[PDB]
Paper text:
Specific insect behaviors can be stimulated after recognizing chemicals in the external environment through conserved chemosensory proteins (CSPs) in chemoreceptive organs, which are critical components of the olfactory systems. CSPs are present in chemoreceptive organs and can bind a range of aliphatic compounds, esters, and other long-chain compounds to stimulate specific insect behaviors. CSPs consist of 100–115 amino acids with molecular weights of ~13 kDa. To explore its structural basis for ligand-recognizing capability, we solved the 2.3 Å crystal structure of the apoprotein of S. litura CSP8 (SlCSP8).
Therefore, we only worked on the truncated version D18-E128 for the follow-up structural and biochemical studies. The protein was crystallized in the space group of P212121 and each asymmetric unit contains a single molecule. The cloned fragment is completely visible, in addition to the C-terminal 6× His tag (the last histidine residue is missing). The N-terminal residues V17-D26 form a flexible loop, followed by six helices (N27–N122), which form the main body of the structure. The C-terminal tag adds an additional helix (α7) and extends to the solvent. The helices of the main body collapse onto each other and form a small central channel. α6 is parallel to the two planes formed by α2–α3 and α4-α5, respectively, but is perpendicular to α4. Two disulfide bonds are formed between C72 and C75, between C46 and C53, respectively. The overall structure is spherical, with the surface charges of the protein being mainly negative. The closest structural homolog apo-MbCSPA6 (78% sequence identity) could be aligned onto SlCSP8 with an RMSD of 0.96 Å over 100 Cα atoms, suggesting a high structural resemblance. Our results showed that the SlCSP8 protein has the highest and lowest affinities to rhodojaponin III and avermectin, respectively, while it displays moderate affinities to 12-bromododecanol and bombykol, with the former being a better binder than the latter.
Author numbering: 17 to 135
The structure:
Amino acid sequence: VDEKYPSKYDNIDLDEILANKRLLTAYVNCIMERGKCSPEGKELKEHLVDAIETGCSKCTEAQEKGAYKVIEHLIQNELDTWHELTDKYDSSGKWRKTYEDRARANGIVIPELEHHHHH
């Protein structure tokens, strides 16, 4: 095995997790504390939880960008999973709405918003 830092992910293996339903499901089980975490799962869980709890106040710029890549993919493609995560970690809904606004600003609007726009 050629991986000295198993706890450690970049933008590409994040893209690969986000692209596969069963990998995404496993990593989400890890972040939701209903499944065992890979080392990289633990790293992503710490940063993603901090993103929802405090807007990644404890994160570097790059760690927040990784968390937002995950959050943006969830808002567009897995809204119910996104709402599971915010129900678990967003003490009242501030980062739920802030991240949703930021996604929409980056052109990544929720499906319903696209439907109202095209109806």
